[PDB]
Amino acid sequence: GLKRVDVRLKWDPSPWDRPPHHLDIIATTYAADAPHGRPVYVVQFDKRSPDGTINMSRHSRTGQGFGFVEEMTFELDRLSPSIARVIVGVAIHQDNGHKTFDDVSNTGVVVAEGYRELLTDGFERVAGATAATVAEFTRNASGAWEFREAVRGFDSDPVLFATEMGSAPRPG
Ligand code: NA
Ligand code: NA
Ligand code: NA
Numbered sequence: 391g392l393k394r395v396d397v398r399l400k401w402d403p404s405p406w407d408r409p410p411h412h413l414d415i416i417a418t419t420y421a422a423d424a425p426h427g428r429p430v431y432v433v434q435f436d437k438r439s440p441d442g443t444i445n446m447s448r449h450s451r452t453g454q455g456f457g458f459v460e461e462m463t464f465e466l467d468r469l470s471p472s473i474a475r476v477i478v479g480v481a482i483h484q485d486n487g488h489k490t491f492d493d494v495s496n497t498g499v500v501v502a503e504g505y506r507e508l509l510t511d512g513f514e515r516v517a518g519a520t521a522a523t524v525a526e527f528t529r530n531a532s533g534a535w536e537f538r539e540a541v542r543g544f545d546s547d548p549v550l551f552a553t554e555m556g557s558a559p560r561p562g
Pocket of ligand 3: 491494496497513
């Protein structure tokens with residue numbers, strides 16, 4: 391299955407007219423015995439993975455730079471056997487007022503394994519959301535990691551999003 395995977399995120403900064411656009415890639419890990427329970431831990435710009443298996447070589451609180459301004463790399467194959475699910479998403483900071491993906495120009499994410507593209511998205515499906523999951527990694531019976539597209543919108547701020555981003559969706 392997948393051995394290592396990365397997530398890169400781009401977005402445009404805000405007009406001189408407005409407070410910064412602060413977006414974060416956020417991931418959570420889930421125990422084999424509770425794939426949809428509480429996160430085992432949360433990974434984002436200000437919180438490293440405790441096991442060293444996830445890194446961010448860059449991150450941004452503004453989107454000022456050009457291209458992919460934030461990235462998170464996962465060495466899935468190096469995760470404890472007791473972790474069997476990972477979910478990664480993107481959250482918009484809400485401290486300058488209610489702000490969705492539709493409010494922020496050229497928001498984009500790419501999920502890849504090296505040179506194999508897994509997902510590219512502009513968050514069009516979740517225009518009204520303050521935060522969104524984009525991808526799920528889960529282990530096989532044989533223990534190999536698999537990817538699934540998991541683009542789903544949420545209405546929470548970044549901290550609340552992390553608590554709920556792994557919960558079982560509603561069937562439909
Ligand atoms: Na950020
Ligand atoms: Na940018
Ligand atoms: Na957008």
